[model samples]
Target chain A: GPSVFLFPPKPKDTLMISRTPEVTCVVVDVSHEDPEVKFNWYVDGVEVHNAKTKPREEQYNSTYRVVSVLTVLAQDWLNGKEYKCKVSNKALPAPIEKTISKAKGQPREPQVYTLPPSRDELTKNQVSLTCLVKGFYPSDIAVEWESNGQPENNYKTTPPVLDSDGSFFLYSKLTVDKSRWQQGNVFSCSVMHEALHNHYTQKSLSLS
Target chain B: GPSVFLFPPKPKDTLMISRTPEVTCVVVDVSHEDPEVKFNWYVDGVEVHNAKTKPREEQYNSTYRVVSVLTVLAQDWLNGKEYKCKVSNKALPAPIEKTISKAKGQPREPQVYTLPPSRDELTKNQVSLTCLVKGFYPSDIAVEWESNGQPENNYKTTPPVLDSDGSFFLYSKLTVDKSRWQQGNVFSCSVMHEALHNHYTQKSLSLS
Candidate 1:
């Protein structure tokens, strides 16, 4: 089964600063076909007819697929500006419109917390250390657990849970025998997110 | 750069039993490790010593990467059973534990709804059709829009939204020209989920 999709035209990175300042690239692709398939481009709500259109063809498994590419300049991709692509086809009752705007900024650093919040007794000879990394993004993030300054590998993590607001949350848990818990082991969870520069956030837990 | 990750031991699918009903394969691999790294297999809170361990070595982008694989029998992975792998290394505080169990069941079929929920006066010559597919599982699903009988493209979809109940919700939107809205053109939103057997759910909309 094939799907027709519309991807927002965007720069490779959030911040697009061009020394040339004139030839930045913004591209969107539309995949669908019919006797009446059409592509319309707009920058900030004004119809953009001067952009270039390219036809791309590729094969997947046994199907020959084609897509239409719309290229626009990045000079007008402003924070408040909107880029909309209105597509029409005989198969659709009305023209379909897709729009995107410049991102607000880099994702904010997440707040980290350990489960049980502060302290708790070993339950059933087992203790679980959960690192809840909430509200961060770009999704290139890592969570590590450490005991006595050593990195731990035995943990389970949900693959970067995503939120409706586009931010990401990571939940990782490290379970250990209660012996270490009663021995006052120092446990720490460290998070590495791209938002930070050459540094990571670490939240630790121990017997208070 | 891709990050190396270690996933907990899990069955490749929901069915852990073969027709033979005797032999089962349970395997887990730990990535980017050192010589001091080791894995301990456990089934249902009991240590398993007969499991086999294998070392894999490779080179990636001028970096030498190594990982350990732990394999065990399937007789131990059963309903109401718990499987865990504890990894120990010089870098960790103690052995870390990863666990998994059989999936409860196929996800409940999602409930689909459109925004605006009902008839409305076309606003600003534009109308938005939103498909909110809620309560599905495994996160492998698709949503689509159609006009008349042909497939339509030009839509934006959020990544599968996670729910506290371990289910998933998907939101897709298709904005269209108000002309069709006023013309009473038929529009439909379709959903494909694994819970369905060889069929999809399509909900249509029009100004009756």
Candidate 2:
């Protein structure tokens, strides 16, 4: 018996369309060189037979890399559907599989940080405050500003950007009269997204 | 205008049969005396007509306690049906509601602990290891013993016990030969339950 490892397949860009698509799942056979492996694709638990697989032989590392690919149609992968890539072999107890799709894949919570009202550059009137919401997934997010006794319509949130590798980044800015900064008021930025385990996260900044 | 809070309702015992089953949702109007409140019951998404509500006036505490009750039929609750009790008033921006049912209620992961083999007396021929799984909910669970490279057929898992407050407890024990104990073998206990966020949890013990 040999121990094996499966690498979860990464999600493909929904906008990237083709007659032949590639969403790959990789497997590492650490011990057995005679790796008799099988791969399967499941769309919402139903077997999808359009995918293909073959192992890249690495005799030097004494490992077999089984790369399984799936052609995910834009409509099938989006609109909140799920896809699972399963890697199996006759020698193992069970198959290794992972699930991913729009609005249903692994949720990566945004790392929240807020830039306080900077006192530099002398004429720091009408201070601009920025919140860095970085490294989140699925691209849907909401950012709110609590002006600390101030009024609304003082903030702007940019559209979420997807970096290579499928994570998300966003920025929000709050403009305030320096008098509020001089008055020692606190500004809070709250983020709401399904990826957040609490579904709500907050970060506050205050200048004394 | 006053601050309000809704305490999450506890799950009803699905086995406790009654024509008038009460799954109560309580609300505290912390600073309001004249509390104008309304309650609504939802089965799945549609409004359930059978529930009723009223406020227990607690004038001394300067609060209004609104208790809302719902009747649970055995088939609807245990067949994995979902129920929601929503509390709302004119002052609140949004209604406060909590969802619960057989498999969808708040998950209470069991606190796992094991009683190791005792060397109290001299006649310690067969050793018993006890794993106490307590304070869990929904009643479904699994326990496994890794006998340190030993065989199966030496463990017993008792039926789960339901305490009065809607939580669950279960116990599992493994019997092993004293000779294996003399070999200084390690025993691992793993608990599987839906309430466990990781879906799998394990604890190991060994006496050198």
Candidate 3:
């Protein structure tokens, strides 16, 4: 019986946290791959000199994968050049390749929205304020909430979810007592993103 | 640049200390060899299962080698069965093989001799009793010196030296005080070997 393997995308894969971090080249294929398989990397058509890899085991006899990462200099990446990954397998007519470049597009600002508690929430003696941040590029963002003036706890946040337009979106919700909401205290949501023209974009709401 | 690698034969390579010990299959070849090269082992032409190996580096690029070992059962080895090692390299049209068996000639007894210190040694205020043990098969031997009934110290022994007739020989030497030598102390040399009909074959010498 063959096995099935699924590797979730690592946070760095979506976050783009740093411009010069090591770029990982990953490949997935089948038939119990062995060391005889070749993995190579190139930067702007020049073959990399010291590329190496590691392995992990999964299903019985299904797909196998390897991870090889190349470090990039901040200056080199800021120059917006291409990095390519090549995998040589006998099943292919020739080596298969995938390429990426930092020249894609200008990073986009995140659109944030805060929703007040509806009538159903008021009936439950508590309120959940939803902080939705979407339409962002470069994926990295920090979400935080505040009640009146102090920072609030007991909030839930989600990792970025990819969008069809090559962007990302996420949500954070802060729950508070219904009495606080009735007091008309201000509830604030702050979204921190590198793409922002201004540092920390914030939004607040109150219902008297 | 090429490197020269010479792997000293491990003790077990010649000891035959036990009827059942691990048997190593070693191969040496030229060029920068990689794991693509194949090594196989067989017990009497029956392909061995679960054969694995380890590697070591030596003289630059000259000859690469791998060591794969197999554990033999006392019963199987005592039965005088053969083990074969096969090496598959691109340079050869077919795999080359080397074979060995326990059914070789009968083990031979060792002949041991002891000599008193030469005149120059007495001039140096010391006596070195040299015990030479030679002409033995299976190569395992222990040599010791006893003076006036007690084991003597300051003795050095050499590992087995290959004899011309596929046998082995070695030497051990003991030094005594000039006063003791002048007393014409009786020095005894004991050589222990499995091939001998007796347990500890010994020889003694004295200076008048």
- In model 1, chain B matches the true chain B with a TM-score of 0.49
How well is each residue in B74-191 modelled by candidate 3, as lDDT tens digits? 4455455687767676655566677776636667788665655534345555555656566687665667788767888666665666655577766565667788877767888887
lDDT of 1: 0.55
Ordering by lDDT: 2, 3, 1
The alpha-carbon deviation from the true structure for residue A192 of candidate 3, after best TM-score superposition, in angstroms, is: 4.3
Candidate 3 - chain A - TM: 0.59
Global lDDT of each model?
0.55, 0.63, 0.62
- Of the native A-B interface contacts, what share survives in model 2? 0.00
**lDDT score for candidate 3 against the true structure:** 0.62
Q: Candidate 2 lDDT, tens digit per residue, A1-208?
A: 4343433222323433343434667666545745777778888899889877765656566555666777667556545667777767776788767776666557787777675532331274566565666668777667878865544476766567654447766556666787786677888888876566556778777774
Which pairs clash inside model 1? A151-B91, B24-B74
Fraction of native contacts (fnat) of each candidate: 0.00, 0.00, 0.00
- In candidate 1, chain A reaches a TM of 0.47
Off by over 4 Å in 3: A1-20, A33-35, A48-52, A73-79, A90-93, A134-171, A175-194, A198-208, B1-208
State candidate 3's TM-score. 0.36
For candidate 2, lDDT tens digit of each residue in B24-77? 676765446346777888878778878767656575666556667776675576
Using DockQ as the measure, name the better of candidate 1 and candidate 2.
Answer: 1
**Preferred candidate (DockQ higher): 2 or 3:** 2
